[PDB]
């Protein structure tokens, strides 16, 4: 398809026409395919504030103390993307034991990016989901029943 760099630059100009938000059958809000997505296509970036682990620990306890929903994604072992305040629509992508998307860290010079790509062909209307103790309600056959 081309270099991950050029794929990323392309995606950032048209990700809005890839997705839309709606009430999920899984939990709360979810992200859905606005159109048809071929396999191995960059759909949307998980944006937010990149912070180190101990910062994320403090921030998380702080959010919970103020009854504010935490939205975080772990890039590597030392960094987390906090999307609670500076997040985008990708923060609403639910988990599924039967995912149609994958989340990949892409090591680029101006920083790491969390990119959600399609693991298969996705038809318009489908809910976007990737693979991340509370019960799992992804509704898939042979669900792993548990999360976190």
């Amino acid at each position: 398809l081309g270099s991950k760099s050029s794929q990323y630059r392309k995606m950032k100009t048209e990700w809005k026409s890839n997705v839309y938000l709606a009430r999920s059958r899984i939990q709360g809000l979810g992200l859905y395919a606005a159109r048809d997505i071929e396999k191995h296509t960059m759909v949307i970036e998980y944006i937010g504030t990149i912070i180190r682990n101990e910062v994320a620990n403090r921030k998380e306890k702080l959010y919970e103390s103020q009854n504010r929903g935490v939205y975080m994604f772990r890039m590597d072992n030392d960094h987390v993307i906090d999307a609670t305040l500076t997040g985008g629509p990708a923060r609403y992508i639910n988990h599924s034991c039967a995912p149609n998307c994958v989340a990949e860290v892409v090591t680029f010079e101006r920083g790491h990016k969390i990119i959600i790509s399609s693991s298969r062909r996705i038809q318009k209307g489908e809910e976007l989901c990737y693979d991340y103790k509370i019960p799992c309600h992804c509704g898939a056959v042979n669900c792993r029943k548990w999360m976190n």
């Binding site: 937010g48 990149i50 500076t86 920083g111």
Partner: peptide, 17 residues
């Protein structure tokens, strides 16, 4: 902005009040 922001920590970022 639709882009990542790199948090700038303070010298006292991890200290107790």
């Amino acid at each position: 902005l639709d882009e990542n922001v790199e948090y700038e920590e303070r010298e006292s970022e991890f200290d107790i009040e």
